[PDB]
Design a binder for this molecule. Structure first.
Ligand SMILES: [Ca+2]
Length: 833
């Protein structure tokens, strides 16, 4: 007395090397897949690995086969998508993940492919909500359970595991199958058994398998079918929410990635989206191209910096290209936008310019704007003489004014004289850089100003810094730079004080691109007993800044042993190498900057890294010992607990807080952090290492990160827990500069001051503003930082939003009202028609 079981054999690809070498092999794999599809009528389907890009890469080498490809996708014999590319998810932005799915989706429609499950063959809490917002209610992970995200959004999930190996003989196969079957049924919760078939003669072998077992039916199948079958008979089983040394391998790739992400998501996209109002066009196709290029840097063996030298050089080009497209589109957008602004309101002879808050946040910053002050075309004289004319010429004092004509406090930072050229004409031009203080400027808005000859209206009030003691202060905070060059800070509003901040710490690293490993006898070097050179560089009533220089004596490299232990592939934990006894001076140079209207401190650290096998972090002792901390993640701030080390991955910031106080450290492209047991927040600036690691020996000398680096990060203190979120918002806003463009005096359709979107206040992450693909509907997306139901209402000009959509920009199932509170941890998208 038994019960029958169905075994679903699903064929799929299961497969260090330079890009092209893997690309040529791809061509071969897809050749064979397609050879079976055409030849073997019994062959159900093949699973094309969760990513559409594989067709692109295939067809760019082999375009004649497009017809064969369309056919097999249309007959459901090739199963493609739903992502564009398989992404190293933790490492990239919130939006990059979404955009992967958006592109993946649209590319699947282009093929007439129906939606496949999300596919995760190798390796973030909001995945459940994200998938559902992309209509992927099932996903497969490399036996079956639900996975719920922070929003109580739930997804069905498969734990599959691959357990030509199949024999051609009856006696062998019987035992073979009996054994694989036991392995499958151990974990299975139904009588529907998944059996993955990896590739790199199955109809024959399946039919043998059906001959052999009366209680087992063996069928060549696919995920779609197996999902429908298994879900109807499911009993049990839930997983909830959510090595990090890949976060700090090859920093410069992380820095670049951050930069182009922010260039597309926060600059180019919102500006184009506004420019459409005037122009009636939106460059959908170019954006799509920019994003693909960027996303090609996003796999699980590329952005991690955890591969071979040639591959990462390749990523550098892709980064520059997408960045250049980003800049191009943003430039077009602002030129179209400023041209339409009515600047006739400035007097004759004035030099107008426009500031855009292109983020969703109240922005406060002392900003600089470079304004062209005189221009000499090459047709006026010999260029060298034009240069010297302007360079010799003495410069009038200048005033900035608003549209009403009132004066606006400012400061002239710098004069420059240089060569330039326009469209659509070469010249010499003279430029001024003007400092302006911008305070709580409204999200998604612009203001116009003009530079006019006259007496500069000086900033007024106390100097922020007092250089005699290396101190500075505003209403929010008071700062002392110690002889150390470390900072002691007082929160003027909570009374909490903090000490030893900004200490730098260097240790050896003899691990590899994947993992950090400190030589067994290494105690580390620190700037705690270093004598800093401290200089006040700027002091005004609105902004002050200090330069801190430190020389530490660092080992030049690991000693001689390392290269041998790498060559012998000696396991990293067993390594006897130590820091070298040859020491050289290592210069660390930090700018600490403070502005009147903000509690944030900004740091810029610069090094010229000419030493190897090491790691440099900056520490922020917190004074609070807790079990948990908070880190920025994916559409989410996650609570985590704090191999003796505990490296972790962060986005914009990490936070440690009490019932009474908190410290928020934010960063651009500095993705690894540790929170030490004493409460120190240690951010990794740079990790230098000689090999790839893993299963063999692959020298990666370029992973040593030699050369000049500048790291941007910062600090914010808060009081009672609730104040956390404002610090998080500012951290986002800090990564998004104002855009500044000059224009001529001209009349226009548009106001010189305007709020394009008026946004709801409260703990919300503002994330995308763009337009929809054939529709051109304005798309805006944001997310709830909190576990609470939050009043949220968006307007564009007067106008309210049409509907709420999902991440593919389609209306929600069911229809939630635009008017409705933003649910806990909700990722919301608005459509504006
Ligand atoms: Ca059978």
């Amino acid at each position: 007395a038994m019960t029958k079981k169905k075994v679903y054999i699903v064929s799929h690809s299961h497969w260090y090397l330079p890009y092209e070498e893997h690309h040529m092999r791809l061509i071969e794999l897809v050749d064979n897949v397609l050879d079976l599809i055409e030849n073997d009528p019994e062959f159900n389907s093949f699973h094309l690995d969760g990513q559409t890009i594989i067709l692109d890469d295939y067809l760019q080498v082999r375009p004649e086969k497009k017809e064969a490809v369309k056919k097999a996708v249309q007959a459901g014999k090739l199963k493609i998508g739903p992502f564009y590319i398989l992404q190293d998810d933790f490492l990239i932005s919130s939006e990059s993940n979404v955009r992967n799915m958006l592109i993946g989706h649209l590319e699947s429609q282009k093929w007439g492919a129906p939606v496949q499950l999300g596919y995760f063959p190798d390796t973030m809490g909001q995945t459940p909500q994200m998938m559902q917002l992309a209509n992927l209610p099932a996903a497969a992970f490399g036996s079956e359970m639900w996975w719920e995200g922070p929003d109580q959004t739930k997804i069905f999930g498969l734990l599959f595991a691959n357990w030509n190996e199949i024999p051609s003989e009856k006696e062998a196969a019987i035992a073979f199958w009996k054994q694989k079957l036991a392995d499958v049924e151990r974990y299975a919760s139904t009588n529907h058994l998944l059996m993955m078939n990896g590739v790199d003669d199955i109809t024959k072998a399946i039919a043998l398998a059906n001959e052999l077992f009366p209680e087992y039916e063996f069928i060549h199948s696919n995920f779609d079918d197996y999902l429908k079958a298994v879900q109807e008979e499911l009993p049990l089983g839930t997983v909830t929410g959510e090595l990090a040394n890949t976060s700090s391998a090859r920093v410069y790739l992380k820095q670049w990635n951050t930069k182009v992400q922010r260039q597309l998501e926060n600059i180019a996209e919102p500006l184009a989206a506004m420019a459409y109002e005037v122009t009636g066009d939106y460059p959908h196709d170019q954006f799509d191209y920019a994003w693909k290029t960027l996303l090609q840097n996003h796999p699980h063996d590329s952005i991690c910096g955890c591969s071979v030298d040639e591959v990462h050089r390749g990523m550098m080009t892709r980064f520059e290209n997408a960045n250049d497209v980003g800049h191009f589109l943003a430039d077009e957008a602002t030129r179209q936008l400023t041209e339409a602004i009515d600047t006739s309101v400035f007097p004759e002879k004035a030099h107008p310019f426009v500031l855009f808050n292109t983020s969703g946040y109240q922005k406060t910053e002392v900003v600089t704007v470079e304004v062209e002050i005189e221009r000499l075309p090459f047709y006026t004289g010999k260029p060298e003489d034009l240069y010297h004319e302007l360079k010799q010429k003495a410069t009038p004092d200048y005033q900035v004014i608003d549209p009403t004509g009132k004066a606006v406090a400012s400061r002239i930072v710098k004069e420059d004289v240089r060569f330039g050229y326009d469209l659509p004409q070469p010249y010499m031009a003279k430029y001024l850089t003007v400092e302006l203080s911008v305070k709580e400027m409204a999200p998604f808005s612009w203001d116009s100003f003009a530079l006019i000859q006259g007496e500069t209206k000086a900033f007024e009030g106390s100097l922020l810094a007092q250089p005699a003691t290396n101190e500075m202060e505003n209403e929010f905070i008071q700062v002392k730079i110690e002889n150390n060059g470390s900072l002691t800070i007082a929160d003027k509003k909570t009374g909490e004080t903090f000490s030893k901040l900004l200490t730098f710490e260097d240790t050896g690293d003899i691990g590899n691109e994947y993992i950090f490993f400190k030589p067994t006898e290494d105690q580390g070097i620190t700037t705690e007993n270093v004598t800093a050179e401290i200089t006040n560089k700027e002091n005004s009533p609105v902004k002050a800044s200090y330069q801190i220089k430190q020389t530490v004596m660092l080992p030049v490299a690991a000693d001689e042993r390392l290269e041998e232990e790498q060559k012998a592939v000696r396991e990293f934990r067993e390594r006897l190498a130590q820091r070298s006894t040859t020491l050289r001076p290592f210069e660390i140079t930090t700018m600490v900057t403070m502005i009147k209207e903000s509690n944030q401190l900004f740091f810029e650290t610069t090094i010229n890294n000419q030493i190897k096998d090491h790691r440099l972090r900056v520490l922020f002792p917190t004074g609070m010992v807790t079990e948990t901390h908070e880190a920025d993640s994916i559409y989410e701030v996650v609570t985590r607990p704090n191999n003796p080390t505990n490296p972790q991955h962060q986005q914009a910031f990490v936070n440690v807080h009490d019932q009474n106080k908190g410290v928020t450290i934010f960063n651009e492209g500095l993705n690894e952090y540790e929170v030490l047991a004493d409460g120190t927040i240690a951010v990794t600036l740079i990790r230098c290492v000689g090999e790839l690691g893993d299963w063999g020996y692959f020298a990666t000398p370029e992973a040593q990160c030699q050369g000049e680096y500048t790291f941007k990060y910062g600090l914010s203190l808060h009081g009672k827990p609730e104040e956390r979120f404002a610090t998080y918002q500012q951290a986002y806003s800090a990564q998004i500069p104002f855009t500044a463009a000059t224009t001529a005096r001209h009349e226009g359709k548009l106001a010189p001051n305007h709020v394009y979107l008026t946004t709801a206040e409260g703990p919300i992450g503002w994330t995308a503003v763009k337009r929809q693909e054939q529709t051109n509907h304005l798309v805006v997306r944001g997310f709830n930082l909190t576990a609470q139901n939050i009043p949220c209402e968006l307007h564009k000009e007067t106008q309210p939003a049409t509907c709420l959509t999902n991440v593919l920009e389609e209306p929600l199932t069911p229809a939630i009202e635009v008017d409705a509170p933003l649910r806990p941890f909700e990722i919301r998208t608005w459509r504006f028609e």
